[PDB]
Automatic annotation (TrEMBL), chain A:
Belongs to the glycosyl hydrolase 2 family. This is Beta-galactosidase. Keywords: Glycosidase, Hydrolase. The lineage of its organism: Bacteria, Bacillati, Bacillota, Bacilli, Bacillales. Pfam families: Bgal_small_N (PF02929), Glyco_hydro_2 (PF00703), Glyco_hydro_2_C (PF02836), Glyco_hydro_2_N (PF02837), LacZ_4 (PF16353). It catalyses: Hydrolysis of terminal non-reducing beta-D-galactose residues in beta-D-galactosides.
Length: 982, 328
């Protein structure tokens, strides 16, 4: 059966592949089996390492006798298996969204179909030909053929599922020969249209097993908890190949025998065992029993968790309690290895998720490696395990009845592989945009096979209802209705493409207060940018369209909560504060009493305490710590903090701020002792005519120069802007000020940017109608300007008037009243842009920080007095965009390291930004290396500023979060300052 | 053996430190294949290159220099070039006075002279190689005279047992160790010992015993004047591997000193500023028996007598194992 085009056939899905079983390794003893290292077992031989590899641009030009035993493979290349070959110098990298990157012609794939040939020799001992020998491939992209000793043994297909073959007629003692042909495209490519980078090769593990002639073939363990969760029964359905005497023993998490049994199973039969008082599994107390099976020379080890998942009245429940699932989606993606993921890179992701209050993970669009679920059983996470099926089509392969055996086996091979994992709670039938007759066959087989778990399918005997990207109004419409008999699960809500997810508090404010809402999964965990060099040596992360690949879906791959080197964005901190399991609210804060709500499902608050702090303008007055917390899950405690308002209020007579931070008390495996889970803040209510004679004014060529006692300010009367600001001779502006109504567009601004650029807001200028200056009878200077903002084709955008005022001490006050045109969508911002000279490097402000915040993304910042540098204001995204703005600033000082600068105040709190990049530099740049750092410091003082939102996919920006206001006043005040003596 | 760690941590926020900040730590010790793979062992010799193949390994020794040249495991190469013995470190800033005696005695660069080499095969398909050697530079009497026994077993372990004496009128050596060079891509270090940072025989009060995992770029401490850095005293075992976990594991009879860098000792000696260091693609791994400490000999007293390497007869007892770390 050599090359009869089985990869375009659809009636030949495999040749000689063994049927699917669970995941286990035969060991030799219980001591070796508890280590987990399968290479220590004498029944297992690895085949990872260094193989001989040859790459072909087509399957046409492959030699016809490469698989023979006496061929010379010495001039071939050498490749380390496991690895994807797109990250090893072979064919160019390619990212594609929901479109197929092949012509939609089922079941045919292009004639230029790239191929790879693998050759590896191995040895085999004498006591191995007396038994059965199997080969296991944990994962190969697309399809592959197989030859052992020059003889055809198998063909298989299916990229994310293992494949096992029987090698007993083919191997002999001594040297052997293994040859694999791997193709890039098969007829299963139509069912694997995932929005991910497309890799190829043998990318997972490969090994050989030696199982004796009568062996345990399949094991399915079943916890059988009673109706009140008080009696347990382990039912171990064992399916053998003959007559076996089987020993079985069961142990608790403490390591104590609770059961032991012997049976004689002749092909299919169970071994029930009783557990009187069971310890249950959940995400925050992951308790696991141990099962040891012994048969002949083989010892099998399983880890059992007792749980029950159900729906009662439209309310999702785990172990009797109502649980809200708080999770993210996750692709297997490494920035240097592709889809080859080592173990420590999984453990780092799990620790970083667990220290950000996450308890659910959805395996996005394919099943992962079998040891990721072994880790998720131990750390504690709820797993929604999706099948490898994404027929984005567009047609309708779902309704084509001769595709049905392809649809069904991708669920059969998944469910049979992962059925003994205590963390999987929901079987999901893959990404669905079309209701079809082939998805319901998958759901019916899965529901007939496994009844202990719920079944998910998106297109919609259904278990739960699912929605991708609702509005916040839509789910509170769904919750209040009476025709809603199923709970609602947010499938892929709050797309995190760009500068963090907007309006994330809005979803959880209505998830918490309502039942019939079981939580959800935020779009992505990571950015998929791949690590790339430039010809200058300033290595960056590239996205799609940087390798000549067609088609390009460029920045659609980034959309994550962490950087590709696993640094957190500000979007993790928003999520961490939103889904925190402890709430604190006010209980007549004047006395000092507080309500503490427990939002755990199974844990009391005995491991937590509250550290409180009173401060005024960022300066601490009193502090302390409470004893401990005691609240049972779902219950409210009252705490009392011993601070004193008599001493504190009689200090400076200002508003005081209390901060209460919930900090843990013991070392977790992911965090240390004093690590903080949540924070909550609370408000507490509590020169004589000597320098007016040095004021001189003159005007030449429209330049109004105003000198005073220790300052000199130069205004340009014909443009209505200050040009020079001095204090003790020190220059403080580098060039002319302006008004600015443009920001660098975010990735959540892909739809509104076409209206902004079509309306001409990309670059506007200023037109001064009339300018007039006076001198008030207190030696104060007023300048009145009538202006207009306009671009070069259309009606002017903003019409207004401004009053500049210079006082005897040197302050510059601005009062601009402006109206904007009525048929204009909404402006990005409105503000004053200044440019301060070289050397301005310190920022010190009183407001919300220490990082970025907006009108809708501000849940992770707290009020205080912060001091940092201009290089730390910047957040270097992969796609350069607007960054570094601090909402609700009270005052801010931008100065040099010796403290010579400007101070900015306003009537009501403003938005503040300081960068080394202007907005046009961030707009014009497309990668990180294209940004040239300016010597100056661009300071911007915004009145309002439109928020981020999540408008990359889903709903648009909300109405109170837009800048839809057409008449406003601004009221800014600028003061030159020498900060060390003021 | 069990280890108890007691860390003194504060309880309230100071103006300089947070709640759970640590002041001190104290640690305490608490006391508590059947003749199947010996038939795949093949040995040959051409041009002085002794090649030993086994069940899943292949090792190439150079008999005329007494050193392994190639170490393989499942076809994966694990050495980039020839091993050597090393008795030179990049001198520290507390070594301004002893460096003149080291450079005057010719310890700056020494070579190896093999007197006699002989290989056998033990009656369990185990290979022994006996080497009589000497370390010497090009004007003076030889420094170290000794003999080494390399041993390759049926699983692929490489055992070294070198007994060495050193010359009587020589001040004290900087180190004595085995230097290996592992190929491009070896980036993870995982060791059980004192860490997580550098430690010596006299500068070791700030490190604690544990199981640490880091990268080779984090082993390095970039001083202003480039000098010796990154060595971990009293290591029990250590694994240097790639990010997928394909590498070598090093054990010994008594705990050794361990170093892993992207810079050889002559690169750190010849450089004078930080920008002059060119990063190598390979990974230089060094397994030291003893190593002379830092001291404070820039100004004041010299290095103390129990902190010097003043010992003229010793045994070394190293063991090297090829490993695929994710399944062992």
């Amino acid at each position: 059966m050599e090359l009869n085009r089985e990869w375009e056939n659809l009636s030949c899905l495999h040749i000689g592949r063994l049927p699917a079983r669970a995941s286990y390794i035969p060991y030799e003893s219980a001591m070796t089996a508890r280590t987990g290292k399968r290479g220590r077992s004498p029944h297992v031989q690895t085949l990872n390492g260094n193989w001989k590899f040859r790459y072909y641009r087509s399957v046409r030009e492959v030699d016809s006798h490469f698989y023979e035993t006496e061929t010379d493979v010495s001039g071939w290349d050498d490749l380390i298996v496991p690895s994807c070959w797109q990250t090893n110098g072979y064919d160019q990298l390619h990212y594609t969204n929901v479109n197929y990157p092949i012509p939609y012609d089922p079941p045919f794939v292009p004639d230029d179909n790239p191929a790879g040939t693998y050759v590896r020799d191995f040895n085999l001992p004498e006591a191995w030909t007396k038994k059965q020998t199997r080969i296991v491939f944990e994962g190969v992209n697309a399809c592959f053929y197989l030859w052992v000793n020059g003889r055809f043994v198998g063909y298989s297909q299916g990229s994310r599922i293992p494949a096992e073959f029987d090698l007993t007629p083919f191997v002999a003692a001594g040297r052997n020969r293994l040859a694999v042909l791997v193709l890039k495209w098969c007829d299963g490519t139509y069912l694997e249209d995932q929005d991910v980078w497309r890799f190829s090769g043998i990318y997972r593990d490969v090994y050989l097993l030696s199982r004796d002639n009568t062996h345990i073939r399949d094991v399915f363990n079943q916890p059988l908890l009673s109706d009140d969760l008080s009696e347990g029964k382990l039912r171990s359905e064992i399916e053998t190949t003959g007559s076996l005497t089987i020993q079985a023993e069961l142990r608790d998490p403490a390591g104590k025998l609770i059961g032991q049994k012997e049976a004689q199973i002749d092909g299919k039969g169970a071994m029930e065992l009783d557990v009187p008082q069971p310890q249950l599994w959940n995400a925050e107390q992951p308790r696991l029993y141990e099962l040891i099976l012994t048969a002949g020379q083989e010892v099998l080890r399983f880890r059992v968790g007792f749980k029950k998942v159900e729906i009662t009245d439209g309310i999702f429940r785990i172990n009797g309690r109502a649980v809200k699932l708080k999770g993210v989606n996750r692709h297997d993606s490494h920035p240097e290895l592709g889809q080859t993921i080592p173990v420590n890179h999984m453990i780092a992701d799990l620790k970083l998720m667990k220290r950000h209050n996450i308890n659910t993970i959805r395996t996005s669009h394919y099943p992962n490696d079998p040891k990721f679920l072994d880790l998720c059983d131990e750390f504690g996470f709820y797993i929604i395990d999706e099948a490898d099926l994404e027929c984005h089509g567009v047609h309708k392969l779902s309704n084509n009845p001769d595709w049905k055996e392809a649809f069904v086996e991708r669920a059969v091979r998944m469910v049979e592989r992962d059925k003994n994992h205590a963390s999987v709670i929901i079987w999901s039938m893959g990404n669905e945009s079309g209701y079809g007759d082939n998805h319901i066959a998958m759901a019916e087989w899965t529901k007939a096979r496994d009844a202990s778990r719920l079944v998910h399918y998106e297109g919609a005997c259904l278990d739960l209802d699912s929605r991708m990207y609702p509005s916040v109004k839509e789910i509170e419409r769904y919750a209040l209705d009476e025709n809603s008999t199923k709970p609602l699960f947010l499938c892929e809500y709050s797309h995190a493409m760009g500068n963090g997810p907007g309006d994330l508090q809005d979803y959880w404010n209505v998830i918490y207060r309502y039942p019939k809402l079981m939580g959800g999964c935020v779009w992505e965990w990571c950015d998929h940018g791949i690590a790339a060099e430039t010809p200058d040596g300033q290595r960056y992360y590239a996205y799609g369209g940087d390798f000549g690949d067609q088609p390009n879906d460029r920045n659609f791959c980034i959309d994550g909560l962490v950087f590709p080197d696993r640094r957190p964005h500000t979007g993790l901190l928003e999520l961490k504060q939103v889904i925190a399991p402890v709430l604190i609210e006010a209980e007549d804060v004047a006395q000092g009493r507080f309500r503490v709500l427990n939002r755990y499902d199974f844990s009391n608050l005995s491991h937590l305490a509250v550290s409180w702090k009173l401060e005024q303008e960022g300066d601490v007055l009193q502090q302390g710590r409470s004893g401990l917390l005691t609240a049972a899950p779902g219950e409210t405690e009252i705490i009392s903090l011993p601070y004193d308002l008599t001493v504190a209020q009689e200090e400076g007579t200002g508003p005081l701020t209390l901060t209460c931070s919930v900090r843990q008390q013991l070392d977790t495996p992911w965090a240390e002792e004093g690590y903080e889970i949540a924070f909550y803040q609370f408000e507490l209510p509590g020169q004589s005519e000597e320098y007016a004679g040095f004021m001189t004014i003159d005007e030449q060529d429209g330049m109004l120069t105003v000198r005073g006692f220790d300052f000199e300010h130069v205004f340009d009367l014909k443009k209505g802007m200050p040009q020079q600001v001095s204090k003790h001779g020190v220059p403080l502006l580098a060039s002319l000020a302006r008004f600015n109504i443009w920001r660098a567009p975010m990735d959540n601004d892909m739809n509104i940017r076409k209206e902004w650029e079509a309306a001409g807001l990309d670059h506007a200028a200023m037109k001064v109608y009339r300018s007039h200056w006076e001198q008030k009878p207190d030696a104060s200077v007023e300048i009145h300007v009538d202006f207009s903002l306009a671009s070069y084709i259309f009606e002017p955008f903003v019409r207004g008037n401004a009053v500049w005022t210079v006082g005897v001490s040197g302050e510059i006050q601005l009062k601009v009243h402006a109206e904007v045109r009525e048929n204009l969508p909404f402006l990005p911002r409105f503000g004053l842009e200044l440019t301060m000279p070289k050397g301005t490097e310190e920022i010190e402000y009183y407001g919300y920080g220490p990082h970025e915040s907006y009108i809708d993304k501000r849940a992770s910042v707290r009020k205080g007095k912060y001091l940092l540098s201009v290089d730390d204001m910047f957040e270097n995204y992969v796609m350069p965009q607007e960054t570094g703005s601090r909402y609700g600033t009270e005052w801010a000082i931008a100065s040099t390291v010796q403290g010579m600068g400007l101070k900015f105040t306003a009537a009501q709190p403003f938005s503040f930004q300081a960068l080394h990049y202007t907005a046009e530099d961030l707009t014009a740049a497309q990668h990180t290396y294209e940004l040239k750092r300016r010597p100056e410091t661009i300071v911007t003082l915004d009145y309002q500023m439109s928020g981020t939102g999540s408008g990359s996919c889903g709903p648009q920006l909300a109405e109170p979060y837009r800048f839809t206001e057409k008449s406003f006043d601004f009221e800014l005040t600028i003061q030159p300052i020498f900060k060390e003596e003021e």
